[PDB]
Design a protein around this ligand. Sequence first.
Ligand SMILES: CC(=O)N[C@H]1[C@H]([C@H](O)[C@H](O)CO)OC(C(=O)O)=C[C@@H]1O
Ligand SMILES: [Ca+2]
Ligand SMILES: [Mg+2]
Ligand SMILES: [Mg+2]
Ligand SMILES: [Mg+2]
Ligand SMILES: [Mg+2]
Length: 448
Amino acid sequence: VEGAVKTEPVDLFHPGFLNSSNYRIPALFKTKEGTLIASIDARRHGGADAPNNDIDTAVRRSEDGGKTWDEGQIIMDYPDKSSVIDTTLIQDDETGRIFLLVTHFPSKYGFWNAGLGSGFKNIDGKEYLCLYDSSGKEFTVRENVVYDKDSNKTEYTTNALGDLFKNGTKIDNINSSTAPLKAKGTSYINLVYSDDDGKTWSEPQNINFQVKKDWMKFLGIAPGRGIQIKNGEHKGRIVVPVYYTNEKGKQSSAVIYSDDSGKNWTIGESPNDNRKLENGKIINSKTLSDDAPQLTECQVVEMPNGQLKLFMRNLSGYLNIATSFDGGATWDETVEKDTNVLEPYCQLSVINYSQKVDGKDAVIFSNPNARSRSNGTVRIGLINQVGTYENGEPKYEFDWKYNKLVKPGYYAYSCLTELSNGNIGLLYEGTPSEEMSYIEMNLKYLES
Ligand SMILES: CC(=O)N[C@H]1[C@H]([C@H](O)[C@H](O)CO)OC(C(=O)O)=C[C@@H]1O
Ligand SMILES: [Ca+2]
Ligand SMILES: [Mg+2]
Ligand SMILES: [Mg+2]
Ligand SMILES: [Mg+2]
Ligand SMILES: [Mg+2]
């Protein structure tokens, strides 16, 4: 229609960019200063997940609303097939700090074989990263100095990237397959930040000691974006979607969150904790033993009063939505299934939109609208109060009033952002692991 905008796709990441053969897993965010940040996995040996790859994190920036982009940078790179996989972006509006979090595995490890627990040990009230030698003897890293099990200082030291130095000379890296001292083979959550609008980024901080429980095997970022709560008692809280597996390997979603501008993090309960299934069974994420109730990658949005809605990948074939009245600490026992929205067991993106649409608060959603990773569709969902819960809290539902096919054929992971002009940017996997496409759309197009 006249006035509708849907730009022709640009290959924002593609084979050869930064000398990476493959790319996957988009994240897209507009900063407070109006800059667009796009992050992605630079998958260097094909498209596979860890451990069958060597994956680095890459970022591109646009300072002109997505019309032109910078030459890109690699911001995290571990050696010898240790990978960083699945990024998410969020900014703290109060301080201007941008966070990028990612899952990190040592060489040989990934989702399916991650070991139990955080990989940290408490010694006299502080958590310290553990390292193991070939015989399984345990050492700890205390302010980057390696101590043995008797708390004798050794000749070894580390840095934030896991390099291992003997008397100050680098000999290996605790994340490699060859090191004489190795971190535990499991997932770690890494956080980096930028205070200059994405131009420069910190060394990684390993926050597993704050968020990963002893009974979790995998705990990983759910890729895309986080939120900072705008309304209500938890205004300011930074919320980052994650998901984990228990000792039986079964997946449950949750969020991690920070109330002190990203300095410290907490994991909330899962919607699987005290969840009431359709057959009436009350489950929890620590004991979940069946595949059907699994809840995996997720993204979160906020309702007008601050209530949170967690949109989750799951095994039902349709969208699942959880509700939190306490800022992501816990969730209501009923996970809703929205049979208006197919969910083929793939990541989805959902964001709040800043302007009312047809007199209602709205969200924008993107996923493959099919029983497979295809038919990529962007939707506008209008928020209505439909009633209350028995506890008196408002009960909200979505009306998926506008649904637009944007990508015929292959469509997998994606990430949305609202742009400064009120339009919508979208970075999507329109190929399995090669070209990652960026488009800008206006509401006239999405409604047409
Ligand atoms: C850490 C990791 O492996 N992430 C991968 C994730 C995961 O394998 C699945 O969620 C496990 O159930 O899946 C996929 C996928 O295309 O489906 C891509 C992610 O990069
Ligand atoms: Ca690497
Ligand atoms: Mg463009
Ligand atoms: Mg090496
Ligand atoms: Mg080797
Ligand atoms: Mg609950």
